[PDB]
Design a protein around this ligand. Structure first.
Ligand SMILES: [Mg+2]
Ligand SMILES: [Mg+2]
Ligand SMILES: [Mg+2]
Ligand SMILES: [Mg+2]
Ligand SMILES: [Mg+2]
Ligand SMILES: [Mg+2]
Ligand SMILES: [Mg+2]
Ligand SMILES: [Mg+2]
Ligand SMILES: [Mg+2]
Ligand SMILES: [Mg+2]
Ligand SMILES: [Mg+2]
Ligand SMILES: [Mg+2]
Ligand SMILES: [Mg+2]
Ligand SMILES: [Mg+2]
Ligand SMILES: [Mg+2]
Ligand SMILES: [Mg+2]
Ligand SMILES: [Mg+2]
Ligand SMILES: [Mg+2]
Ligand SMILES: [Mg+2]
Ligand SMILES: [Mg+2]
Ligand SMILES: [Mg+2]
Ligand SMILES: [Mg+2]
Ligand SMILES: [Mg+2]
Ligand SMILES: [Mg+2]
Ligand SMILES: [Mg+2]
Ligand SMILES: [Mg+2]
Ligand SMILES: [Mg+2]
Ligand SMILES: [Mg+2]
Ligand SMILES: [Mg+2]
Ligand SMILES: [Mg+2]
Ligand SMILES: [Mg+2]
Ligand SMILES: [Mg+2]
Ligand SMILES: [Mg+2]
Ligand SMILES: [Mg+2]
Ligand SMILES: [Mg+2]
Ligand SMILES: [Mg+2]
Ligand SMILES: [Mg+2]
Ligand SMILES: [Mg+2]
Ligand SMILES: [Mg+2]
Ligand SMILES: [Mg+2]
Ligand SMILES: [Mg+2]
Ligand SMILES: [Mg+2]
Ligand SMILES: [Mg+2]
Ligand SMILES: [Mg+2]
Ligand SMILES: [Mg+2]
Ligand SMILES: [Mg+2]
Ligand SMILES: [Mg+2]
Ligand SMILES: [Mg+2]
Ligand SMILES: [Mg+2]
Ligand SMILES: [Mg+2]
Ligand SMILES: [Mg+2]
Ligand SMILES: [Mg+2]
Ligand SMILES: [Mg+2]
Ligand SMILES: [Mg+2]
Ligand SMILES: [Mg+2]
Ligand SMILES: [Mg+2]
Ligand SMILES: [Mg+2]
Ligand SMILES: [Mg+2]
Ligand SMILES: [Mg+2]
Ligand SMILES: [Mg+2]
Ligand SMILES: [Mg+2]
Ligand SMILES: [Mg+2]
Ligand SMILES: [Mg+2]
Ligand SMILES: [Mg+2]
Ligand SMILES: [Mg+2]
Ligand SMILES: [Mg+2]
Ligand SMILES: [Mg+2]
Ligand SMILES: [Mg+2]
Ligand SMILES: [Mg+2]
Ligand SMILES: [Mg+2]
Ligand SMILES: [Mg+2]
Ligand SMILES: [Mg+2]
Ligand SMILES: [Mg+2]
Ligand SMILES: [Mg+2]
Ligand SMILES: [Mg+2]
Ligand SMILES: [Mg+2]
Ligand SMILES: [Mg+2]
Ligand SMILES: [Mg+2]
Ligand SMILES: [Mg+2]
Ligand SMILES: [Mg+2]
Ligand SMILES: [Mg+2]
Ligand SMILES: [Mg+2]
Ligand SMILES: [Mg+2]
Ligand SMILES: [Mg+2]
Ligand SMILES: [Mg+2]
Ligand SMILES: [Mg+2]
Lengths: 122, 130
RNA sequence: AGAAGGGGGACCGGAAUAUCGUGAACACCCUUGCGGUGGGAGCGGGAUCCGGUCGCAGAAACCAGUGAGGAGCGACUGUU
RNA sequence: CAGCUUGUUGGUGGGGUGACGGCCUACCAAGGCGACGACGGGUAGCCGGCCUGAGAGGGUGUCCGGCCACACUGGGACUGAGAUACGGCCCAGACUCCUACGGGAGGCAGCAGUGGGGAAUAUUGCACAAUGGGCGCAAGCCUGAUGCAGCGACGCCGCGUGGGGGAUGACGGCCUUCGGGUUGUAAACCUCUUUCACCAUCGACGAAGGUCCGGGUUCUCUCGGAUUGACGGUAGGUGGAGAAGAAGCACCGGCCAACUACGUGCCAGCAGCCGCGGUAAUACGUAGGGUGCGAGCGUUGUCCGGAAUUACUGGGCGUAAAGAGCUCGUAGGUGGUUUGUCGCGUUGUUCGUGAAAUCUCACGGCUUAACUGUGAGCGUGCGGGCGAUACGGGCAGACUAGAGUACUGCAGGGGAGACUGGAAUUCCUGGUGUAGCGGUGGAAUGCGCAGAUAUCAGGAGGAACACCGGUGGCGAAGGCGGGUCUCUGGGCAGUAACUGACGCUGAGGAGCGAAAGCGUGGGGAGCGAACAGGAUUAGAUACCCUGGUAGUCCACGCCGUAAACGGUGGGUACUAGGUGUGGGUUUCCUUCCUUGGGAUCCGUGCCGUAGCUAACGCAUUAAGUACCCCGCCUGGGGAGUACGGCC
RNA sequence: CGGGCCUUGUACACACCGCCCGUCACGUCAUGAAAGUCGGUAACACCCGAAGCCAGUGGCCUAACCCUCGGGAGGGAGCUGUCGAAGGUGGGAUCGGCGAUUGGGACGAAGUCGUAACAAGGUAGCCGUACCGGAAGGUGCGGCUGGAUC
């Protein structure tokens, strides 16, 4: 609109939102994983999702999702947390990395075996 | 009322679209020079200057084919009074990849892109005609 | 609201002989008066700056607001 | 974040400095900066460059190179050509250590290394052989610079895990319509070559150098001699035997290359999106098969892209988000025709500069490549000189077409004030008169029988102005109609008398601005929020009925909002027509009395071509074609809300 | 009551046995207010003021220079003064955290109460304003058609 109007008042880009908020710049983040429990997803899914409350070293309390089938988590226990959305749990935006400090890999897993953590066979 | 050259281009464009055979419009030296360029490039038939009630009137007859098709496809003012546009001899504009004409006002007068590159002079880009 | 909270304050000398501000004698005109203009003497007033001096203390004795915050009641000065 | 500044702004005389200077001081004046954002708050080392992108742009400042700042925190000076003086001095502070308690010592953001933090980042290595550096006449001595090595797939590049024949459709696996298909020339087997790894051996270039000895006297020059390399017995070369020592990861619903079986059975689970799983799942887990890539392959994090979803290139605002309620006007932006000049913009050319590296194009060298050297580009720019004057601009003129003024007419519910008219409703007084009236879909509440409603005469008072009246007029918008008088604004047409571009728009700002509402005073017929009763209803805080206060009215102030709407900012020019209506002018047909037709200017409607639009529709009163200025939009909610501020 | 054709409105398409609004109850998340309370930041006024530079003073000390041999010149130690970091006192500014209690918001299952809107949605609907009401809302005044009527 009106090169003079642009000179007086330039263009301003849109405002995005930070997504790595708990990680605050880091690709992964360590946590203590208090109060493990289960959750039911949004309306048309009716499942039983495995989650955990993780207190990160960035001094933030977030909720993470535990992928794979079957886990060894408990109360206070060190986990490594990464980013990732679940799209059916309301506000879960983090995932527990499987194959890290306390979360051993998925047993009997044979396909893709690197996600979920698993050595080939020896 | 601002930018009489844009007024001139708009009058000619509207008449050409309306299939008119001629236009009348107030006469100025710049418009006369642009009309001369257009006739030399073959986008119009001959033009002439009358004497109206006050000042002089410039009349242009427009050119059509055997069938009823326009010889002028487009017209657009480039250097507007709200944003002047200039170019150097290195990067003079190209209209329709070269099948058109861009009017350049140089220290040597009005010129087209070919005539201005052959002389190595730039200036203000008045309008594209093609 | 003098909110609160702070700083200076004595004496001596110098600036300072019109330093500055009050009144204005001797002597300067005139429609001569209980008149006017300049003039600046002597006598008093106040403040500042600089240097020095003294004591524990310079508002010197007498004299001369305590301040701040939150509620209740009555608006207020008044009256019993 | 709207007011900041008193050595502050300027001057004079001094002081001070390597140097100009409020750098400092005494005096004098009262200035200086600010909407082109002062002062304040947040964040940040800057650049050559790097990543992305068609480009313009966006993100970034890590290796390498340049500049700046700092050296436990804060301050200060000294020495010197030169000081943020990292491994100097003084003081203060925090911390660690020694002490005979009086007092002392220290500073890895140098290399290596330790603890800690963290998702995460290395050896307490070798050598001064080369280059640079300091002192010395020199030999020399010093150099954690540097030259290399170690470690980490951390990255880029390159090469290997063999090659040539070979349906036992080996065997087996898996699927099968039980016939076969597939893995698959793939294996077995036959044969061939050994890049790299392994073993043995020779062994560098980097050194037209550094040293001492000889011609050369020295200077310069070779000569030849020893000797000197951390890397390193390394790279490389040569030779030996053997397919010999060496492949994995992701995915296969669509995007997007890649499909079947079994198990499971809204469970377990998957998922970037939308979705997949509730008994025949190509979407979950396994198998077979396939696809992509390969010493890598996936996930997470971040940036660009796609995104024309901030639009300069390159978007929009009738109804999708988006024209301020309307106007006047400040800064600003933009500007009609024409003459001369300047040469600021613009443009041509030349000189300087735009370091190197990186980037592009061509070669040159490492066995190739990555990497490296050379040459030309690039470096969009800036400064100096010399040309041009079309356009923009400045300066000096001219003109009347835009704008304004003058005169003469014209139409109008435009505005304000004062006075004034009649119809009707209500009430009061009186006459007649008697039992109902009122109200609804049906009723009741209510009024009346103490004389209502009805009807006639008189009176009081307030508000609104039937017919005219419309689609029509006026006003910037909101709005404006009983009449008369007084005062007052704008518009149109004609004339062309006057001025001579005086124009347009307009951030902020100011003014006006329906109704409701607020303050003070007055008034109050009718209507009528709230309120009360009746009715309906399951209920009825409503709709319907009977009452009824504020308010509606007036004076003077405030408020400043409306679906304040044409849901369409203002100005200007241009682009078929047809047909109504309001206000002019005007020939001709001038009587064809017709106040008809034509022409022209200014309004206000309908219909329609081109054109535009997602469509609906708009269409000379544009939502078409263009130019100038302004306001506004960037998914839906949260929300036109909170906090701050102004009123 | 049901059906057929045309036309009109629609926020319905599981197609009115449709869609859908707002209180209330339970839960979760984020957020405003709040007597007060805990931190951070940058200043400001005044008090005190180390080192050091500069300016003075300087009987105490002082080899070069001068001397008439007594001393003089010039210097220094010390001392005073301006400026001065750190510290202290005070009143404010500003950025955050927590806070009994309290306001709304969003999302939740197959909870309770009505039925406001969409059809003439059963009283046309929306806009501004005012009063009222469990709640959607109602009513008054003015406006609009993004409604109807002959
Ligand atoms: Mg006081
Ligand atoms: Mg007080
Ligand atoms: Mg004393
Ligand atoms: Mg007192
Ligand atoms: Mg109280
Ligand atoms: Mg009490
Ligand atoms: Mg009292
Ligand atoms: Mg009271
Ligand atoms: Mg008193
Ligand atoms: Mg001064
Ligand atoms: Mg001076
Ligand atoms: Mg920083
Ligand atoms: Mg692009
Ligand atoms: Mg520092
Ligand atoms: Mg440190
Ligand atoms: Mg320091
Ligand atoms: Mg030196
Ligand atoms: Mg020195
Ligand atoms: Mg220092
Ligand atoms: Mg140090
Ligand atoms: Mg050090
Ligand atoms: Mg040093
Ligand atoms: Mg180190
Ligand atoms: Mg860690
Ligand atoms: Mg750690
Ligand atoms: Mg060396
Ligand atoms: Mg050397
Ligand atoms: Mg790895
Ligand atoms: Mg495919
Ligand atoms: Mg199955
Ligand atoms: Mg699967
Ligand atoms: Mg993106
Ligand atoms: Mg873009
Ligand atoms: Mg654009
Ligand atoms: Mg758009
Ligand atoms: Mg527009
Ligand atoms: Mg809408
Ligand atoms: Mg809209
Ligand atoms: Mg409007
Ligand atoms: Mg102006
Ligand atoms: Mg102007
Ligand atoms: Mg101008
Ligand atoms: Mg012009
Ligand atoms: Mg370069
Ligand atoms: Mg080569
Ligand atoms: Mg040049
Ligand atoms: Mg005129
Ligand atoms: Mg009036
Ligand atoms: Mg009455
Ligand atoms: Mg009667
Ligand atoms: Mg009667
Ligand atoms: Mg004239
Ligand atoms: Mg204006
Ligand atoms: Mg404005
Ligand atoms: Mg007003
Ligand atoms: Mg009103
Ligand atoms: Mg009132
Ligand atoms: Mg009230
Ligand atoms: Mg009143
Ligand atoms: Mg009534
Ligand atoms: Mg009523
Ligand atoms: Mg009632
Ligand atoms: Mg509004
Ligand atoms: Mg209106
Ligand atoms: Mg609007
Ligand atoms: Mg307009
Ligand atoms: Mg327009
Ligand atoms: Mg008309
Ligand atoms: Mg569209
Ligand atoms: Mg139409
Ligand atoms: Mg449009
Ligand atoms: Mg508000
Ligand atoms: Mg507020
Ligand atoms: Mg039929
Ligand atoms: Mg339909
Ligand atoms: Mg709740
Ligand atoms: Mg709060
Ligand atoms: Mg001192
Ligand atoms: Mg609380
Ligand atoms: Mg309703
Ligand atoms: Mg309803
Ligand atoms: Mg109803
Ligand atoms: Mg209704
Ligand atoms: Mg009500
Ligand atoms: Mg209402
Ligand atoms: Mg109404």
């Amino acid at each position: 609109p009106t090169i003079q109007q642009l000179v007086r008042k330039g263009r301003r880009d849109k405002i995005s939102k930070v997504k790595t908020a708990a990680l605050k710049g880091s690709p992964q983040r360590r946590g203590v994983c208090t109060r493990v429990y289960t959750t039911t997803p949004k309306k048309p899914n009716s499942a039983l999702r495995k989650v955990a409350r993780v207190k990160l070293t960035s001094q933030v309390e977030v909720t993470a999702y535990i992928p794979g089938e079957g886990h060894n988590l408990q109360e206070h226990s060190m986990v490594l947390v990464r980013g990732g959305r679940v799209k059916d749990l309301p506000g879960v935006r983090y995932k527990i990395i499987r194959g890290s400090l306390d979360t051993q890999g998925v047993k009997n897993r044979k396909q893709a075996r690197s996600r979920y953590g698993a050595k080939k066979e020896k | 009322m601002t930018d009489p050259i844009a007024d001139f281009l708009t009058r000619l464009r509207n008449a050409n679209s309306a299939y008119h055979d001629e236009v009348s419009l107030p006469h100025s030296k710049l418009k006369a020079n642009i009309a001369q360029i257009l006739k030399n490039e073959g986008y119009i038939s001959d033009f002439r200057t009358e004497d109206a009630r006050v000042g002089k009137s410039l009349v242009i007859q427009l050119k059509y084919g055997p069938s009823r098709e326009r010889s002028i496809a487009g017209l657009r003012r480039v250097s507007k009074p709200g944003l002047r546009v200039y170019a150097k001899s290195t990067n003079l504009p190209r209209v329709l990849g070269g099948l058109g004409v861009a009017i350049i006002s140089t220290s040597s007068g009005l010129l087209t892109d070919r005539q201005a590159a052959r002389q190595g002079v730039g200036g203000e880009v008045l309008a594209y005609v093609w």
